[PDB]
Design an enzyme around this catalytic site. Structure first.
Site, short mmCIF file in Angstrom:
data_model
loop_
_atom_site.label_atom_id
_atom_site.label_comp_id
_atom_site.label_asym_id
_atom_site.label_seq_id
_atom_site.Cartn_x
_atom_site.Cartn_y
_atom_site.Cartn_z
CE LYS A 17 -1.66 -1.75 3.72
NZ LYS A 17 -2.06 -1.04 4.98
NE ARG A 91 -6.34 -2.57 8.62
CZ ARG A 91 -5.26 -3.14 9.12
NH1 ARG A 91 -4.11 -2.49 9.21
NH2 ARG A 91 -5.35 -4.39 9.52
NE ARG A 125 7.55 -2.69 6.46
CZ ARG A 125 6.27 -2.38 6.67
NH1 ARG A 125 5.65 -1.56 5.85
NH2 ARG A 125 5.63 -2.89 7.71
NE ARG A 158 5.93 -0.69 10.32
CZ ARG A 158 4.78 -0.59 9.66
NH1 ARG A 158 4.76 0.04 8.46
NH2 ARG A 158 3.69 -1.14 10.16
NE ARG A 169 1.86 -5.42 11.01
CZ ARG A 169 2.91 -5.22 10.22
NH1 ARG A 169 4.07 -5.79 10.53
NH2 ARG A 169 2.82 -4.40 9.15
#
Ligand SMILES: Nc1nc2c(ncn2[C@@H]2O[C@H](COP(=O)(O)OP(=O)(O)OP(=O)(O)OP(=O)(O)OP(=O)(O)OC[C@H]3O[C@@H](n4cnc5c(N)ncnc54)[C@H](O)[C@@H]3O)[C@@H](O)[C@H]2O)c(=O)[nH]1
Ligand SMILES: [Mg+2]
Length: 217
Positions: A17, A91, A125, A158, A169
């Site tokens: 996203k 969400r 990431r 993160r 998640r």
């Protein structure tokens, strides 16, 4: 454009996203509003919101609706004069119903990417915390490893991109956010794009958006 565009981008965590949003804002006249960047900024600033958000983020749990809807509506009211792209809000159904009482969403872009694929992506990431720029070691690597291209300051990972938290998640997304995809499907505004690589998806998103919003120089 006489009518400002109101766009939402959605997808399971790690589907791309934020990556797609950076390309969209690069090529189209609209402002990108990222809930996650906004929350990570509130944690740096030590706000009320930032402190309580950390406990939810770090456990892979959604922050309470009352907090998130107030934060997002407040930020949006600063952006009445721009076409915008909402990334990471809504969400849950209450978040989506609230947004609707304020704005008429033109289009909801849904990235449908395999969970196995996404799981691997979040493992690699890296981000520059001040700017929120996102990197991956395979797909969008920096010139030097672990160092933002410009500030030359440490890029970090993160806390929520740990494999146990990624699982949590993904389940929260399946349980609470997929109903939101169905909510927007029935409203006639969901446009879904399936793939395993951002670069195989981007052409379709790009062409689709050409039909909704001006391009940027
Ligand atoms: N190999 C490869 N790599 C690629 C490819 N394309 C992209 N990549 C790379 O893959 C990685 C992921 O891409 P990305 O663009 O950054 O992913 P993304 O889909 O934005 O994922 P996330 O940031 O993880 O979304 P998510 O829904 O989890 O987070 P967030 O809003 O931060 O929410 C975080 C937490 O904050 C709270 N929260 C956030 N929003 C909330 C809300 N509205 N309500 C309540 N709580 C909210 C919640 O606790 C949430 O868990 C990057 O490294 C990128 O470089 C590709 O083709 N190939
Ligand atoms: Mg993101």
């Amino acid at each position: 454009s006489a009518r400002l565009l109101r766009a939402v981008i959605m997808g399971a965590p790690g589907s791309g996203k934020g990556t797609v949003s950076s390309r969209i804002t690069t090529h189209f006249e609209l402002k990108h509003l990222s809930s996650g960047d906004l929350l990570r900024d509130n944690m740096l600033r030590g706000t009320e919101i930032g402190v309580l958000a950390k406990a939810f983020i770090d456990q892979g749990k959604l922050i309470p609706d009352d907090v998130m809807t107030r934060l997002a509506l407040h930020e949006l009211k600063n952006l009445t004069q721009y076409s915008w792209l909402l990334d990471g809000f809504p969400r849950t159904l209450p978040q989506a119903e609230a947004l609707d009482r304020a704005y008429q969403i033109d289009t909801v872009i849904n990235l449908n990417v395999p969970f196995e694929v996404i799981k691997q992506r979040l493992t690699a990431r890296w981000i520059h915390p001040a700017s929120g720029r996102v990197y991956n070691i395979e797909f969008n690597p920096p010139k030097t490893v672990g160092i933002d291209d410009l500030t030359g300051e440490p890029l970090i990972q993160r806390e929520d991109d740990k494999p146990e938290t990624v699982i949590k998640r993904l389940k929260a997304y399946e349980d609470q956010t997929k109903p939101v995809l169905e909510y927007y499907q029935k409203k006639g505004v969901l446009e879904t794009f399936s793939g395993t690589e951002t670069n195989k998806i981007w052409p379709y998103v790009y062409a689709f958006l050409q039909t909704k919003v001006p391009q940027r120089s």
